[model samples]
Target: MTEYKLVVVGACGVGKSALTIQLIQNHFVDEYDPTIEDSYRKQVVIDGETSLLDILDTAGQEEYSAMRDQYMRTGEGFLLVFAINNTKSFEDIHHYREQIKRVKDSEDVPMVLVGNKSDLPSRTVDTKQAQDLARSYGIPFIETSAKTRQGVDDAFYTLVREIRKH
Candidate 1:
């Protein structure tokens, strides 16, 4: 059995918790307040093998910098996502990615780029733009609609698959 300590990293209100909740609970979360931290445990079957997932849903504000470092240090992989309708949310991903890299002190960390809120009609960040960025970083990218549970399972499973690459 394998285990993945995947930290969901993204800007505030980017639906980090939504995507995670959608995966674990098989239900969508409409409203969730950003807290200092929350964690969930789930097991999934991949390739006929059970794998444990330790998910840390983190606060996205700047005040939690100290706490952020602690989680980043031990996280084995990162589900680094961004919101398509919010440009700032997309831009904030750069810092999270760099921070994770710095904390792990490795250039080839297991990470996947996610663009959430794909159901929204207003798109501030284009899909091609995000795809190019993910390609530039040598990571996989997927657009997801947590509200609809679209691509939710695939993203999490893909992240776990990425961890296996190492």
Candidate 2:
């Protein structure tokens, strides 16, 4: 079977790991663990074909920035996640995109912009902004709730579909 190394990345506590866990195992973890650290792999099945996803829940604590850059260099694609309730998180995405470009050696990588925590009603960022930003980067964007699993499936599967079309 053909395999793809899709990477999940975002500022710390942006539900990068949770989304991966939900996708692979169909579960969620509400309690935060400051020591949860980073992750490396998970499995995803598409059309009866299983692909090993190398997901990196990069540390948003600033010190692990280098490690995050390293993962971006080799992954086939990326899931750039942000929190729907955090406007600042939305603003930081531009930097992450630049970092991805630097590491991957091009701006042509397939990526999806994920606005997570959609279950929260107190949204600080608007969907239009997310869509516009993604449009500017020439990628698709979607809001997701890892809690209700709303948009979570699309957030990943849509990205995979786009990559496959490429």
Candidate 3:
């Protein structure tokens, strides 16, 4: 089986853990939980090929930690996450994208823009605008609801495809 180095990056409270745990744990929890674990591994069969989806989690860590560059350099693909309810989280994508490009020394690095928390009705970011941003980014975008398990696997699986394409 091949391995995919995927990094989940987003600001705090952007549902990074919810999306990731929904995939790895196969469920979502509403209560607050500390992000004590960072590395998670899951085996998946994508297109009939068994693959290892290794996720380096950054759900509850410092935004400007040194660890950011470490994974940015080694990650094969990135899940650039943001919450639709928070406008600030959306802009964080820009910083992360710039950082990834700078760290990789390449403009067209593999990545997927994820708009999470779609289960909530009070969404602040517009779908078409996010789609346009993803279009401008030349990467795929998916709206997800970790609570409802909506588009969770596809988000990770999409990163695998992006890595393959890269």
**Local error of candidate 1 at residue 50 (angstroms):** 0.7
Please give, for residues 96-129, the per-residue lDDT of candidate 3 as tens digits.
Answer: 8998899899988999999999989898999897
In candidate 2, stretches whose alpha carbon ends up further than 4 angstroms from where it belongs are 38-42, 45-50, 60-66
Candidate 2, residues 27-47, lDDT tens digits: the string is: 888675644555566567876
TM-score quality measure for candidate 2: 0.86
lDDT of 1 at 63: 54
Backbone clashes for every candidate come to 0, 0, 0
TM-score, model 1 to reference: 0.93
Query: For candidate 3, which ten residues in a row score worst on lDDT?
Result: 59-68
Better of 2 and 3 by TM-score: 3
TM-score of each prediction: 0.93, 0.86, 0.93
Determine the backbone clash count of candidate 3.
0
